[PDB]
Amino acid sequence: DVSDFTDSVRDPKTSEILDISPCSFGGVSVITPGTNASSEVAVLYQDVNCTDVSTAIHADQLTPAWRIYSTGNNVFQTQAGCLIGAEHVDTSYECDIPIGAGICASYHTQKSIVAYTMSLGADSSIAYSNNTIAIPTNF
Amino acid sequence: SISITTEVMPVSMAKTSVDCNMYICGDSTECANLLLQYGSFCTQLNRALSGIAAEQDRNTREVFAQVKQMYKTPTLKYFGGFNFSQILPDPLKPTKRSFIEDLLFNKVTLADLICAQKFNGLTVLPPLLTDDMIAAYTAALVSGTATAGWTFGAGAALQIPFAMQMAYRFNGIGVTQNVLYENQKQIANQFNKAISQIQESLTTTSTALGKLQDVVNQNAQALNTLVKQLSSNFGAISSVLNDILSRLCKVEAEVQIDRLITGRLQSLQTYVTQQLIRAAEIRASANLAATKMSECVLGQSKRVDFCGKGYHLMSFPQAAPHGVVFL
Amino acid sequence: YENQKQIANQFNKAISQIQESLTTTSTALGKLQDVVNQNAQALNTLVKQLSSNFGAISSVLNDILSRLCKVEAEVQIDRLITGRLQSLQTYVTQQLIRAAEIRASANLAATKMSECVLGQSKRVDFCGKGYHLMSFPQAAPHGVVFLHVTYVPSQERNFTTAPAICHEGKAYFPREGVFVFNGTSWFITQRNFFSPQIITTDNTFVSGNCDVVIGIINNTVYDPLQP
Numbered sequence: 001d002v003s004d005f006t007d008s009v010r011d012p013k014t015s016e017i018l019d020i021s022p023c024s025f026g027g028v029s030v031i032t033p034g035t036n037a038s039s040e041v042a043v044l045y046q047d048v049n050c051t052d053v054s055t056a057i058h059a060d061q062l063t064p065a066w067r068i069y070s071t072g073n074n075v076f077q078t079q080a081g082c083l084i085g086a087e088h089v090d091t092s093y094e095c096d097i098p099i100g101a102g103i104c105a106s107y108h109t110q111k112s113i114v115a116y117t118m119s120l121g122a123d124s125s126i127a128y129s130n131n132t133i134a135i136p137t138n139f
Numbered sequence: 140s141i142s143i144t145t146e147v148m149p150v151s152m153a154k155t156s157v158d159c160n161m162y163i164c165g166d167s168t169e170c171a172n173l174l175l176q177y178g179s180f181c182t183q184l185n186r187a188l189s190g191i192a193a194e195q196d197r198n199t200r201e202v203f204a205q206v207k208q209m210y211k212t213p214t215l216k217y218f219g220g221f222n223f224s225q226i227l228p229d230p231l232k233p234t235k236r237s238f239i240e241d242l243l244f245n246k247v248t249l250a251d252l253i254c255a256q257k258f259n260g261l262t263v264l265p266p267l268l269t270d271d272m273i274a275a276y277t278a279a280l281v282s283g284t285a286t287a288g289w290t291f292g293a294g295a296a297l298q299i300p301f302a303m304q305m306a307y308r309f310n311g312i313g314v315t316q317n318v319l320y321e322n323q324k325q326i327a328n329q330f331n332k333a334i335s336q337i338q339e340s341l342t343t344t345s346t347a348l349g350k351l352q353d354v355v356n357q358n359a360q361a362l363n364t365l366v367k368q369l370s371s372n373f374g375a376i377s378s379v380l381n382d383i384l385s386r387l388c389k390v391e392a393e394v395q396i397d398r399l400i401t402g403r404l405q406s407l408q409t410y411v412t413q414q415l416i417r418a419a420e421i422r423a424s425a426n427l428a429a430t431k432m433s434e435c436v437l438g439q440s441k442r443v444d445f446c447g448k449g450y451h452l453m454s455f456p457q458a459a460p461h462g463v464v465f466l
Numbered sequence: 467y468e469n470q471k472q473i474a475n476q477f478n479k480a481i482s483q484i485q486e487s488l489t490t491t492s493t494a495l496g497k498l499q500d501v502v503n504q505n506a507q508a509l510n511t512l513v514k515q516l517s518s519n520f521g522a523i524s525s526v527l528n529d530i531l532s533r534l535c536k537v538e539a540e541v542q543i544d545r546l547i548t549g550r551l552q553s554l555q556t557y558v559t560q561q562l563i564r565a566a567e568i569r570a571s572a573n574l575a576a577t578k579m580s581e582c583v584l585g586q587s588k589r590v591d592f593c594g595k596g597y598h599l600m601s602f603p604q605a606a607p608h609g610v611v612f613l614h615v616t617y618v619p620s621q622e623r624n625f626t627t628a629p630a631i632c633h634e635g636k637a638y639f640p641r642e643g644v645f646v647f648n649g650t651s652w653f654i655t656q657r658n659f660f661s662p663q664i665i666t667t668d669n670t671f672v673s674g675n676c677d678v679v680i681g682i683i684n685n686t687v688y689d690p691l692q693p
């Protein structure tokens with residue numbers, strides 16, 4: 001290739017063509033509350049579709065402690081990638097640990113790591129009328 | 140006459156991270172052992188890149204998040220003859236952006252090149268705030284300006300009709316209140332005409348958003364230069380790390396490998412230094428954008444040529460790819 | 467002057483709240499600790515990097531000279547010299563960039579001291595949230611702390627308003643303020659505070675007939691005459 005890395009090789013016996021590719025995919029991020037409160041973590045594989053995560057990690061040849069972070073009931077799919085080790089919630093809070101793409105994570109309540117959509121702000125509405133005004137009376 | 144002029148300012152750039160061990164020694168155990176002898180050099184670049192990424196998120200947040208409540212867009216886009224429909228989201232169309240923002244998002248083109256970056260440890264992380272969230276912020280700012288005026292910046296929102304707001308804004312530049320009320324419809328027609336001209340100018344192909352494409356181009360060139368520099372042998376017998384280990388002995392192979400290690404380390408150092416300088420420039424631009432949003436959207440400014448050519452009346456923000464556009 | 471003592475009590479109360487907030491443990495001064503931490507980490511990294519051998523036989527300079535000859539010892543020493551030179555160059559480049567950032571922050575602090583302590587500023591949110599009144603500087607380790615006092619409007623009320631009134635075919639516009647309807651009659655008030663005044667000839671001015679202004683109401687204007 002342009003990086004002087006060989007990618008395709010011809011078998012000297014069968015004259016077929018084989019593609020060699022790196023056995024290390026892209027980035028892995030670890031989300032931790034801190035090792036002063038607990039010892040569980042969440043794992044984010046970014047730019048990886050979580051349907052086929054086990055192919056990208058080769059979890060068959062890892063430790064059994066690495067297989068419980070490969071699939072389960074705690075699988076979430078965000079625009080960043082696939083997040084394993086956290087529970088999805090529907091309420092929105094202020095951002096604590098920024099995962100990305102609008103998704104934040106925190107350590108809520110026995111405590112567990114939760115992932116949610118960040119809250120932009122408080123919701124308010126003021127009515128527009130063409131013949132009324134609001135004037136302060138105190139300060 | 141009433142004139143609407145546009146100003147484009149960059150806010151953030153792309154956040155990138157580099158895996159040092161897989162950039163320098165790709166899947167090589169011997170090169171990994173020789174790399175540990177260079178202690179605490181790969182951990183010094185990740186700290187700098189993490190600082191840059193956190194700075195980018197801070198830039199975007201502390202420019203755009205300036206209101207403490209979110210205002211719903213009104214059902215009526217006609218405030219006393221002034222047509223606000225082009226700069227507010229359209230309920231019937233299922234996009235969460237205004238029309239001018241839709242034009243702005245098409246004039247900047249964000250995109251075996253990305254795959255080679257991915258295979259060598261170069262990764263681009265997504266921004267924390269998505270485009271819909273920034274669109275929500277700008278819609279809240281425009282709605283608050285149309286319905287409340289200058290008061291919501293300094294505290295809670297105080298309702299006022301739009302004509303009386305324009306009367307105060309004419310008082311602020313030295314023209315009495317009656318001049319607005321005598322010929323209000325002429326001013327409304329000029330406002331609508333200038334909005335239409337801005338729309339027409341943005342529609343046609345131009346280079347008005349050239350300052351935003353140059354950020355994207357420079358980051359792409361830097362990352363491609365890192366990918367391309369891996370083919371240099373740096374004075375060694377070859378640039379392939381697996382051919383030096385196939386026909387040489389340990390004492391004579393370590394001497395050849397160390398040259399490649401030093402060359403790739405100093406290439407990656409050049410990249411991180413250039414990124415730090417460019418990040419400083421982007422931070423200065425974002426600080427100016429934040430103070431412009433504070434002093435020209437939440438109020439009226441008497442500084443000369445700070446917010447356009449003429450006497451400033453009021454101003455509107457719009458979102459753009461990695462940037463902001465002030466009208 | 468009407469309610470000076472209420473303002474004095476609010477000033478003293480806010481000073482006490484600032485004192486109470488600074489007393490308890492917090493991270494309000496976190497921007498000043500991060501300067502100290504970064505410089506310490508950089509200097510410790512320079513100290514720690516002296517143990518790398520940079521591809522030579524050893525990182526100790528006195529062991530290469532105890533078991534090697536001149537031609538073969540200079541080759542090993544030059545690698546250490548180059549590695550330490552480029553480490554020290556990395557340190558000085560990082561220091562230059564950090565110094566530029568600190569200089570920009572200090573320039574902003576100087577202009578803030580000039581425009582908010584020696585005067586009053588009309589720039590929005592330049593010196594706090596609200597309308598700026600006055601400001602005080604305090605010294606901090608490698609930094610400055612500004613206390614801005616601000617006027618915050620409160621307790622809003624609803625009123626019915628009009629752009630102008632006309633008495634006898636002549637439109638009257640307010641000079642400073644707005645026309646409001648308390649429920650009985652029409653008064654003129656300032657925008658920021660509610661203090662109603664009687665519509666009079668001195669605080670209004672006349673412009674044309676009342677057939678072009680959109681939304682004009684009819685009323686009476688007091689004149690200071692008729693003795």
Ligand SMILES: *[C@@H]1O[C@H](CO)[C@@H](O)[C@H](O)[C@H]1NC(C)=O
Nearest residue numbers: 010011012013014015016017
């Ligand atoms: C051996 O190499 C030849 C190439 O000349 C190939 O045709 C053949 O299939 C290979 N294998 C055997 C078992 O002969």
Ligand SMILES: *[C@@H]1O[C@H](CO)[C@@H](O)[C@H](O)[C@H]1NC(C)=O
Nearest residue numbers: 047048049050051078079081
């Ligand atoms: C994952 O794959 C599905 C189809 O197999 C596709 O629709 C989806 O966009 C993919 N996700 C990502 C993040 O690429």
Ligand SMILES: *[C@@H]1O[C@H](CO)[C@@H](O)[C@H](O)[C@H]1NC(C)=O
Nearest residue numbers: 137138139469472476620621
């Ligand atoms: C403003 O509120 C305070 C509450 O502490 C009250 O004591 C004061 O009388 C109010 N101002 C007026 C003008 O009533």
Ligand SMILES: *[C@@H]1O[C@H](CO)[C@@H](O)[C@H](O)[C@H]1NC(C)=O
Nearest residue numbers: 216217222223224225331335
């Ligand atoms: C506002 O402008 C749009 C086109 O930009 C137009 O369709 C709409 O009718 C206008 N609103 C009016 C005239 O009230």
Ligand SMILES: *[C@@H]1O[C@H](CO)[C@@H](O)[C@H](O)[C@H]1NC(C)=O
Nearest residue numbers: 126127129132622623624625
């Ligand atoms: C003012 O009137 C509007 C509309 O009638 C109402 O929504 C709002 O709550 C009122 N505010 C006060 C302080 O009375």
Ligand SMILES: *[C@@H]1O[C@H](CO)[C@@H](O)[C@H](O)[C@H]1NC(C)=O
Nearest residue numbers: 647648649650651652653662
């Ligand atoms: C204005 O209306 C308010 C409504 O409560 C009333 O209290 C006040 O006395 C009125 N002012 C007059 C009649 O001057």
Ligand SMILES: *[C@@H]1O[C@H](CO)[C@@H](O)[C@H](O)[C@H]1NC(C)=O
Nearest residue numbers: 129130131219629680681682
């Ligand atoms: C205010 O709006 C109402 C309803 O749209 C209208 O009847 C009235 O004439 C308007 N008043 C003005 C424009 O002064």
Ligand SMILES: *[C@@H]1O[C@H](CO)[C@@H](O)[C@H](O)[C@H]1NC(C)=O
Nearest residue numbers: 632634635681682683684685
């Ligand atoms: C005010 O009264 C006069 C009486 O001469 C009338 O001509 C005018 O239309 C009135 N204005 C209104 C009802 O807004």
